[PDB]
Design a protein around this nucleic acid. Sequence first.
RNA 1: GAUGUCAUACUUAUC
Lengths: 144, 208, 70, 78
Amino acid sequence: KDPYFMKNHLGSYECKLCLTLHNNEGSYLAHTQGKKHQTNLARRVEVKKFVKIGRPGYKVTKQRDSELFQIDYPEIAEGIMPRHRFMSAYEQRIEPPDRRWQYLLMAAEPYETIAFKVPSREIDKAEGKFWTHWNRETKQFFLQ
Amino acid sequence: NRFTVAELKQLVARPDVVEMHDVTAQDPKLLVHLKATRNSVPVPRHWCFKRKYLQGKRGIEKPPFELPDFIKRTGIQEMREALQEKEEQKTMKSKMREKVRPKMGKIDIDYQKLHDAFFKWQTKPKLTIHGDLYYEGKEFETRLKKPGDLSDELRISLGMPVGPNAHKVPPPWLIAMQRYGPPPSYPNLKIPGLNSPIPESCSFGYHA
Amino acid sequence: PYWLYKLHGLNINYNCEICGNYTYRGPKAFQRHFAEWRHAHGMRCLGIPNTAHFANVTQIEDAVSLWAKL
Amino acid sequence: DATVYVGGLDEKVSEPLLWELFLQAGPVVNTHMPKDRVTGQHQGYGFVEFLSEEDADYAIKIMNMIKLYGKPIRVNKA
RNA sequence: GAUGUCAUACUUAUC
């Protein structure tokens, strides 16, 4: 099984390892033994479906600070922290018109997501690890 | 005696036709005048090689034959392939027995279909000009595009369905063209949604 | 190998004064590198555009004279 | 200043396809795609040199949301 | 790519 000897479109034999040609069949088998042929041979989804959704009543309180929202949540009995994220109003269930604002929504696993619309462009940061906290001893979330 | 390439380029009115090998010839001015003529043909590139234009496509794959539509519309190629498949399975005794009592009527497709294919169904091939010469890599250089237009392969690779509506048929980068403005490299370029009507210019670009 | 370098015209020192007096080990290699990005970036510092008339141009003064003559 | 580096492209992308993709924002003078001659495959990066630096900067700043074969293509100044 | 000895194969309606 020689991977270099092939048949051309003229009824001959071609060796692509040394780039040689052979007319008859006796010259292709005799071209493997030699110095040039030897030199050429030597050179070469689960967590989303199991999440319970009961949609309880959230308790969010906003306060205009100057240099902050506080959400009171029940005991979740788990290490999963509620995540906050800022999204646009273009994606909705009914797609209502004149929706060109942004909304910061906080979502948890045993509870529903609470969303607050922000008319301003950029007045704060919606990062989870920058200006957010979640006290598990009192079970209260703070977003600044 | 022999001038350099810079003097031959400055003396001749067309310095683009001057080469490095023409400076050491017997007549640089006559060669510069003959190479920069109107109906002149350049020299082939195989005159300075070392393979005589026949040792390049040694191991490269090549098709055996490219049959046209007029020769393939007569059914002679399938009959020839069937005869070659039937003749390759016969042994020496079957080839020696067919020489004394041969079997007539191998194909017998038609008699006037070939004349109608060569006279009425004749198609003109894709010819070329007399100045366009041939080279070794001329059969593989097929890369030799327009602003405002997109091909089917580029639209399939980028995922942009071309339609009559200007909602998704322009690419989503063109909104950046709504942010910064028109490109300075093409002042006469017209894009739909910014400086062209959306139902009128359905080609997603026009060079006016 | 020495025979493949002697038959193809390699192992010959050539000086190119356009791209900072660089060295080239072949006439065909220098002709291939003349229509390249390095020679174009070297010629763009002097203000000469990348055209076909300055293909065989080596010196900076001859290239400047060819750019001023056109 | 007139050359922009385009990265994040797949191996199935070709040089005429990249030229037709780059010609939508401006005429490119040259396009260099470094590829290995041993395997015959691209490296996923290329350099497009235009006729001016402002057109190359506009093509680099206008190709920040281009997606080819599911992969986002990044354009930077070089 | 060149040299020097052997083999294979082809063309010019050669005899």
